[PDB]
């Protein structure tokens, strides 16, 4: 059980949400799409961190 929990934790810690990167000549539509990607990333990172802390416990 301890080895299974460690393997689940070890899989999850190695799969962090990817921070969106802005390409240096983005159109107005691509900047709005980036802000939507960044808000999505902050939410996905909050969920990932909450799951990581539960698995760590």
């Amino acid at each position: 059980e301890s080895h299974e929990a460690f393997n689940e934790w070890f899989k999850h810690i190695n799969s962090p949400p990817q921070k969106p990167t802005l390409v240096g000549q983005a159109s107005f539509t691509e900047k709005v799409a980036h802000e939507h990607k960044e808000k999505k990333y902050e939410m996905d990172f909050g969920i990932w961190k909450g799951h990581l802390d539960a698995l760590t416990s």
Partner: protein, 470 residues
């Protein structure tokens, strides 16, 4: 310009007459072409390309030249005779195209001909970054040289002066075959083509050498080719060559469109992919470039100028993908032809060979290993469907011959004749066979026919037996 001229059959005659009217003239023209192809680019003056674009384009031009020249030669050869190719390859028009005595450059006053030249070429060992310029087009050069040797008898009349010369003066085939498989990862395509031509060549070679009776030759050759046994488990070279051919290839990330339908793009990709000379559906630069421009023109985006950088990046990826797909199809037809080569070559050889297979035991062992490996490779879920018929014919032949071999042992007298036979092995072979039979869909009726034929030949061997039948 010269090569372009070459491409017209009628004129070859006038041209050759012209070249030869004057002894000085013919001599000079020919050996000039020759030294020209000896592209001895700057060797020891502290580097060839010490300057810049200059010597790079020097090499580029050297390359293009080489190419045009070789293309010319090839085309000429097939036209007819006395062809410009016969003069450049060292075959005197006055002498019979069959009575010609080919000699090493400088022996009895023989000028360096194209033969000598190409020989020198491949001899060096082309680990050079250049590789074969055929990379984006054609030939490995080596390919044209093997073709000329084959036409010795293939295009009638050139007989064997070439094969006699390659055997006695240069020991060419033994020196070059030691280095197979060529690991041109660069163009797995190139490596494959190299291997193919080499195959056909050495094949007809051995055939005729044996039809004659030259045992030592044939001996050394096949001995080496097959003794994976370690001397002074080292897999046999023929099996190593087969290991180098991957009959399973990776597949392209699915196209993703924000503004655009995917299913439509796949249809467009399927459509403009026109059939190349090898029968592959590829847009190639043609459809690609013009087709991409047409798609951009069709996508009208007036008001929202603002979204332009995006569309630009997106079309780039589509381009990359179609390119990868085409590359892959090319790599595939190459592998198909290479496999054809292997199969035919080997099979024909052994089976039509004057049976001097001393350990028929070892003969059968070899047959066994071969079948095993083949089966393994093809029973794989990722195996390319285009390689199947080949495997099928291969197995048919292999099996009939092997059955004959089995009876050829059951019909003698010396525990030493069923020793290396293996009934279990007979059975496992049977199992693999059946497996393959099953995996074969309705499409490949022909493959199934070969396999049914192989099975029938196998069942004739059994005509311990009651236990095997059960």
């Amino acid at each position: 310009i010269l090569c372009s001229i070459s491409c017209n059959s009628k004129i070859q005659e006038k041209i050759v007459g012209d070249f030869t009217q004057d002894q000085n003239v013919s001599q000079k023209l020919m050996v000039g072409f020759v030294s020209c192809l000896d592209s001895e680019e700057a060797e020891e003056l502290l580097d060839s390309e010490k300057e810049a674009e200059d010597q790079v384009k020097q090499t580029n031009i050297r390359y293009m030249t080489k190419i045009h020249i070789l293309n010319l030669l090839i085309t000429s050869l097939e036209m007819k005779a006395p062809n410009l190719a016969m003069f450049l390859l060292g075959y005197e028009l006055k002498k019979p195209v069959s009575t010609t005595n080919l000699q090493d450059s400088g022996v009895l006053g023989c000028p360096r001909t194209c033969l000598h030249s190409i020989l020198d070429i491949l001899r060096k060992g082309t680990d050079v970054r250049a590789g074969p310029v055929a990379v984006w087009d054609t030939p490995h050069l080596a390919e044209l040289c093997y073709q000329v040797i084959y036409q010795l008898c293939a295009c009638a009349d050139t007989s064997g002066p070439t094969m006699r010369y390659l055997r006695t003066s240069q020991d060419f085939l033994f020196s070059q075959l030691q280095h197979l498989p060529f690991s041109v990862e660069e163009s797995e395509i190139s490596a494959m083509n190299q291997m193919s031509w080499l195959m056909k060549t050495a094949t007809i070679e051995l055939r005729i050498t044996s039809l004659n009776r030259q045992r030592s030759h044939t001996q050394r050759l096949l001995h080496l080719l097959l003794d994976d046994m370690p001397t002074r488990k080292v897999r046999r070279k023929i099996l190593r060559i087969l290991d180098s051919i991957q009959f399973s290839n990776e597949i392209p990330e699915p196209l993703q469109l924000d503004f655009f339908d995917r299913s439509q793009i796949e249809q467009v990709i399927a459509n403009c992919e026109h059939k190349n000379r090898r029968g592959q559906t590829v847009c190639n630069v043609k459809l690609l470039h013009r087709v991409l421009v047409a798609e951009v023109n069709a996508l009208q985006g007036m008001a929202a100028i603002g979204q332009r950088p995006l569309l630009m990046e997106e079309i780039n990826t589509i381009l990359q993908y179609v390119v990868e797909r085409n590359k892959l199809l090319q790599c595939l037809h190459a592998k198909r032809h290479a496999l054809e080569s292997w199969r035919q070559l080997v099979e024909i050889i052994l089976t039509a060979c004057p049976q001097d297979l001393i350990p028929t035991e070892h003969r059968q062992l070899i047959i066994r290993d071969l079948l095993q490996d083949l089966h393994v490779k093809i029973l794989d879920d990722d195996a390319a469907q285009e390689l199947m018929p080949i495997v099928a014919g291969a197995v048919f032949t292999l099996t009939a011959h092997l059955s004959q071999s089995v009876r050829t042992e059951l019909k003698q007298p010396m525990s030493a004749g069923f020793a290396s036979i293996g009934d279990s092995s007979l059975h496992m072979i049977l199992r693999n066979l059946l497996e393959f039979i099953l995996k074969t869909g309705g499409g490949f009726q022909r493959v199934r026919a070969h396999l049914y034929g192989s099975l029938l030949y196998y069942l004739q061997i059994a005509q311990v037996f009651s236990k095997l039948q059960r």
